[PDB]
Write a protein that binds this ligand. Structure first.
Ligand SMILES: OC[C@@H]1O[C@H](O)[C@H](O)[C@H]1O
Ligand SMILES: OC[C@@H]1O[C@H](O)[C@H](O)[C@H]1O
Ligand SMILES: [Ca+2]
Ligand SMILES: [Ca+2]
Lengths: 504, 504
């Protein structure tokens, strides 16, 4: 039997996995998006269902001034004696913290702040003797030596027990990071990422008889990389190991699907899966001797997408994210039952701090995304529409606005410093359907006059100008509904009747 | 003593070096630019003076349909018994050929076509017994196995002697290429590039007692790479080895100076230098154990930029290139003595085939480039100016044109599919000075009214949107003078009085 990589498509980086009985739970990084840290469930490691998010309250997730270069970085999920622990970094605060839960269907605790523990990629390991270890990277604010650091931790107080020690510098790649400590057959293994989360990404491993080392580098490191290859999956690493309940071993990790030349990616880093075998001399090998594929053999794993939101519910679906903490008064599912009402502010898609926007990830190269908007702008600055958004300097949008006292539908783009109105047509109806067809190379922007059903191709836009390589940061493209008054509060409300996401 | 890398700054890739006595000659790839294959001279390996180009006649250099993804790929320069040989690929023709010279101050021969020898990166080696070997890559048109191929060659007839054989597949990196065969102390060494000429680039080496092998991989391959590092020099490889006349060994090779995150480069691949030491077990080591730097120790090498063209000469300087073969009638240094006259055609900077343009490489991050233009356009399509140009979809320009019967100075940009007029101002004089200040992040576009000396900042543009990563191809940014009629022949002539390039 076979599965396909990625196993979780779209913007789902830095996967960390946790087994409880015969069920599996998995978390990814979310940066400036709210709610933060999606969490998934699976019984077979291949098929994942999103259960929700871990960070859903402003007290858990302070995103003021966060951008797609900051906010929430890699999270690690662990379980001990009925309690789940989620440990991560808010890079905008430069703070590491834990939240806890005894029930993933409920909400998580308030943060337990780890005072004095810097760096990124914090991880926890519950040792068989009852000791608990925190492992992480060098602290850039203290200007520490590059490498992996560790201490015993008291999980109640959020405080270190004894001393913080350097345990490994890695093999010599850049940015030794993503550390996870495991104990298997009488050896401690330290699994890390090196080379940076771009084309030099690799996974390396070390071992010792003791939790703090000294650690010996695996003689065939790196144990997983696509560096110096032209494989369709690139930038592979940030692995976390799990033992399936049939006894076999697996890793989850992220990778990209770049297109064009030089390679460029716009769906973010996506969660992948590969098997592990243990050598006779006691080292793990991932995949086909350090390389993986799009199509994989499933071993003994038991093998087994149209999304339509009409906004009838008064709870938002788990697809939707906001840019930083939502200003809650500017969204309503109750003010006009069966529509989403949005109040645009002075802030635009060019601004980082709390623009009126709700969005969901592009999870497929080929897809058609649409919405129906009612909007009658009162002034020329006023605008509402549908956006393809990477970050504040990289986004395309089709929208209704007003220019010299006439209503127009527009295609607008922000690419770096370029802000351009690509096309403009006069429009005469109170509602409009926007419709975007995505393929690997371009987005086609159309609008429909709803009562006639007539469709009009307004323009197109390249995917590669929204790619992470061009745009910066650590994220993937979102499809978003938004409103703005372009420097003033938008006096007209925007109402969205529904949103459809139809992958090929 | 110390030198700085790169030793040849700006767009100078795939360097191949050749010693004759106590002097050194070096060539680089040029793609769609004409004249093709620049050639440099040095006495110390650090300081290079451009002597001219190797391919200066249409019969040598057929560039119709060539773009910055095609045209002339890596060249190799060799010397035997008073005769220099230059061997390279015209990828647009898919043909490999040699040109010869007995005097580098003169012109080279007509091409000797190597019938049936495909692939890229052809190289020559003159063995101590008098045999001559051609070495190259797999032929994509025949769909051959990835690797390095070799035959004995008859240099008169341009024909293979005996059989073409696969001699090495490399260590397992992508795109094994840039092969050079050497014989040193009784061993043949095969030096190659792997991993692709981007962030996975590396140099690897193999050896044998026989010219066709079997070849044994160096046990510490790769012998030069910056893959999986954050060093300011990236994408290092395509090396060629030389023995200096004091007995010490050196390699030239290319690398990039990327900026931003993810890393992006706009000065092209630039020629670098590093020392070689030979191990006791008979393997070469480049640099500081496989890594190099911006600042290097010069060993015993004997250690030691404002460019102003007023167009008074009737020969073009060696700074200037055209996009493909120039249409010679559309440029004149004699029609108006002391100016360059240019006749714009229907073709624009958006078109690949022979737009009216003359340009020179950006060789410094920080520089000020200027020109003085006389231009009085007769119709609204007519345009002449100064361009910052990467390729047909990636260029910025400040120009004089006409709109609804008025003369305007404009800042225009083409970025992917986006074509935008960023700013426009009415202009009232027959001449204008355009002036561009470059720094690592942006270009600032100004104009000067010459008789008043008043200066006006028209706009700015990001460097990263012209980067190779964004734009495609294998080249660096040029500063260019151009004219066009935007779909029609330009009825007005354009005259440029001078051009200044002032690095910081
Ligand atoms: O994804 C953000 C950061 O990049 C690296 O993957 C690191 O492990 C993580 O925290
Ligand atoms: O620069 C063009 C091609 O890329 C690689 O550097 C190869 O060696 C060369 O022919
Ligand atoms: Ca509805
Ligand atoms: Ca002059």
């Amino acid at each position: 039997m076979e599965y396909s990589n990625p196993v979780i498509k779209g913007f789902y980086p830095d996967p960390s996995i946790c087994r409880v009985g015969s069920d599996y739970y998995l978390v990814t990084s979310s940066f400036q998006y709210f709610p933060g840290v999606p969490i998934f469930h699976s019984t077979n490691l291949i098929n994942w269902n999103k259960i929700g998010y871990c960070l859903i309250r402003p007290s858990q997730l302070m995103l003021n001034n966060a951008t797609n270069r900051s906010g929430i970085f890699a999270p690690t999920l662990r379980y001990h004696e009925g309690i789940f622990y989620l440990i991560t970094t808010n890079v905008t605060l430069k703070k590491n913290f834990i939240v806890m839960s005894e029930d993933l269907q409920g909400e998580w605790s308030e943060p337990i702040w780890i005072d004095g523990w810097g760096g990124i990629d914090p991880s926890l390991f519950f040792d068989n003797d009852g000791k608990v270890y925190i492992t992480g990277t060098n602290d850039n604010a203290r200007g520490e030596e590059l490498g992996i650091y560790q201490a015993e931790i008291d999980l109640k107080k959020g405080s270190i027990i004894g001393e913080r020690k350097l345990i490994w510098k890695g093999t010599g790649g850049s940015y030794p990071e993503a550390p996870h400590l495991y104990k298997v057959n009488g050896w401690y293994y330290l699994l890390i990422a090196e080379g940076g989360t771009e084309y030099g990404h690799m996974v390396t491993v070390a071992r010792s008889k003791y939790p703090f080392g000294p650690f010996e580098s695996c003689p065939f490191n790196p144990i997983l990389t696509h560096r110096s290859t032209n494989h369709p999956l690139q930038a592979i690493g940030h692995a976390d190991i799990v033992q399936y309940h049939d006894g076999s071993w697996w890793a989850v990790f992220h990778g990209t699907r770049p297109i064009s030349y030089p390679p460029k990616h716009h769906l973010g880093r996506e969660t992948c899966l590969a098997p592990i075998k243990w050598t006779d001399d006691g080292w793990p090998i991932i995949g086909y001797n350090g390389r993986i594929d799009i199509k994989m053999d499933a071993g003994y794993l038991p093998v087994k997408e149209i999304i339509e939101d009409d906004f009838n519910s008064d709870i938002f679906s788990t697809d939707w994210n906001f840019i930083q903490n939502p200003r809650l008064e500017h969204y309503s599912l109750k003010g006009r039952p069966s529509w989403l009402k949005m109040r645009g502010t002075e802030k635009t898609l060019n601004d980082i701090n709390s623009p009126t926007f709700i969005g969901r990830r592009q999870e497929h190269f080929v897809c058609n995304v649409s919405t129906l908007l009612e909007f009658k702008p009162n002034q020329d600055n006023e605008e509402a529409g549908l956006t393809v958004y990477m970050n504040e300097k990289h986004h395309y949008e089709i929208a209704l606005t007003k220019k010299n006292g006439r209503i127009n539908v527009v295609l607008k783009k922000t690419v770096g410093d370029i802000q351009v109105v690509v096309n403009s047509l006069e429009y005469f109806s109170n509602t409009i359907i926007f419709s975007i067809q995505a393929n690997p190379e371009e987005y086609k922007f159309s609008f429909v006059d709803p009562n006639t059903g007539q469709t009009y191709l307004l323009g197109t836009g390249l995917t590669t100008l929204l790619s992470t390589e061009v745009a910066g940061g650590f994220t993937g493209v979102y499809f978003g509904l938004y409103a703005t008054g372009n420097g003033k509060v938008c006096t007209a409300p925007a109402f969205f009747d529904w949103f459809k996401y139809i992958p090929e």
